Design a protein around this ligand. Structure first.
Ligand code: SF4
Length: 178
């Protein structure tokens, strides 16, 4: 069994075309503000109910966000795709791999591997670094191949699932406004 970090419902929809016995872990203190976190979480919940997925919801709180910001703040001023995002993704995946140890999963992964905007090599490198540090296997798949991303868009449109237009953190919202 594999514990798969869930970033958002569109990425989840892409991912589940290619996985069948996973437990999903929605953990995203990078998402601000709270109203946006709640909207994305409710979209994930909608997908999970529709397909009977097993999703666990991680902590979201002042303390959790402060830990995340502490981990990414020395690089605030680099764009997206830089070392800021490397630290961000490593924070999320480290918490996922810890949770996988705690729940008896021998493998972990992330729906960010389904995200058209993210750097697949950077994520593989992070997952394998964490695999080394915690001895939980990182399951890599290019979840976007097979045109699976389009399958995710189609199901999103049908199920009426919210599709966000910024990565999640305050930095990415500011870059959205440019
Ligand atoms: S842009 Fe996305 S990956 Fe980069 S720091 Fe913000 S939330 Fe994390």
């Amino acid at each position: 069994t594999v514990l798969i970090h869930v970033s958002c419902a569109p990425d989840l929809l892409t991912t589940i075309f290619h996985v069948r016995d996973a437990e999903f872990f929605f953990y995203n203190p990078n998402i601000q503000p709270l109203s946006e976190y709640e909207k994305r979480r409710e979209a994930v919940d909608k997908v999970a109910n529709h397909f009977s997925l097993n999703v666990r919801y991680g902590e979201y709180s002042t303390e959790e966000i402060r830990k995340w910001y502490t981990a990414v703040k020395d690089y605030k001023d680099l764009g997206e795709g830089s070392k800021r995002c490397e630290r961000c993704i490593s924070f999320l995946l480290e918490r996922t791999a810890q949770e996988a140890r705690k729940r008896g999963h021998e493998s972990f992964s992330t729906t960010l591997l389904a995200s058209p905007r993210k750097n697949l090599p950077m994520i593989e490198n992070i997952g394998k670094t964490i695999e080394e540090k915690y001895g939980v296997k990182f399951f890599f798949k290019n979840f976007r191949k097979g045109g699976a991303y389009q399958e995710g868009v189609r199901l999103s449109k049908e199920l009426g699932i919210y599709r966000q237009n910024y990565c999640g953190c305050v930095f990415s919202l500011l870059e959205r406004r440019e």
